[PDB]
């Protein structure tokens, strides 16, 4: 049969998890997404020649301590580390994000891709060293997206894919 993977979008507020996922699954760019919003999307998709059935958990909520959360981050087998390249402080929340999802993934090495959002506006803060220098020391890949062109959203999701299949086998 067809290989299904779990995968989990999560990021600062506002960095684009919803416009990334959105025009994944329903090919739009959604300018004023419900920020409450938490549903899981699925997709088949091949890559490398090969079809996969794709499960996104578009994440959101509160920062805030969640053992509910925690079970349901628990069940993802890959994730995307969302920022935005003009919002320093999301890119500074990366680190908390990895951080969480090696807790609740008993500090396995966790399928995981950088995704810097919003690639398309002019108004950038972080350097693009400065994530690829991140993304070095972790050990991820980094893909520069933005939701609104469309440019790179495949490529992220599909990356991420290609991780999962390396830790697995
Ligand atoms: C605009 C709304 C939105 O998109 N967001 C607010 C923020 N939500 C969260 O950060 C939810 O919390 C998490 C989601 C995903 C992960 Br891998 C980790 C967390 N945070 C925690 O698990 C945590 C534990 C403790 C002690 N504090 O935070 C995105
Ligand atoms: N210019 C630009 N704006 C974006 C992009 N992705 C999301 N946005 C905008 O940023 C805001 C937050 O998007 P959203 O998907 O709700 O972020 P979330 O809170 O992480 O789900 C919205 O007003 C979007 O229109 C992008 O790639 N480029
Ligand atoms: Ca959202
Ligand atoms: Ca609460």
């Given at each position: 049969?067809?290989?299904?993977?779990?995968?989990?979008?999560?990021?600062?507020?506002?960095?684009?998890?919803?416009?990334?996922?959105?025009?994944?699954?329903?090919?739009?760019?959604?300018?004023?997404?419900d920020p409450t919003?938490?549903?899981?999307?699925?997709?088949?998709?091949?890559?490398?020649?090969?079809?996969?059935?794709?499960?996104?958990?578009?994440?959101a909520?509160?920062?805030?301590?969640?053992?509910?959360?925690?079970?349901?981050?628990?069940?993802?087998?890959?994730?995307?580390?969302?920022?935005?390249?003009?919002?320093?402080?999301?890119?500074?929340?990366?680190?908390?994000?990895?951080?969480?999802?090696?807790?609740?993934?008993?500090?396995?090495?966790?399928?995981?891709?950088?995704?810097?959002?919003?690639?398309?506006?002019?108004?950038?803060?972080?350097?693009?060293?400065?994530?690829?220098?991140?993304?070095?020391?972790?050990?991820?890949?980094?893909?520069?997206?933005?939701?609104?062109?469309?440019?790179?959203?495949?490529?992220?999701?599909?990356?991420?894919?290609?991780?999962?299949?390396?830790?697995?086998?």
């Open positions: 049969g067809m290989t299904e993977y779990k995968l989990v979008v999560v990021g600062a507020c506002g960095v684009g998890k919803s416009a990334l996922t959105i025009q994944l699954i329903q090919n739009h760019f959604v300018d004023e997404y919003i938490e549903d899981s999307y699925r997709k088949q998709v091949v890559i490398d020649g090969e079809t996969s059935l794709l499960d996104i958990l578009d994440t909520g509160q920062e805030e301590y969640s053992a509910m959360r925690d079970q349901y981050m628990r069940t993802g087998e890959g994730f995307l580390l969302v920022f935005a390249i003009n919002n320093t402080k999301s890119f500074e929340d990366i680190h908390h994000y990895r951080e969480q999802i090696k807790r609740v993934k008993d500090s396995e090495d966790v399928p995981m891709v950088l995704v810097g959002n919003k690639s398309d506006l002019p108004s950038r803060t972080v350097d693009t060293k400065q994530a690829q220098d991140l993304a070095r020391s972790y050990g991820i890949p980094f893909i520069e997206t933005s939701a609104k062109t469309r440019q790179g959203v495949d490529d992220a999701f599909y990356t991420l894919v290609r991780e999962i299949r390396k830790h697995k086998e």
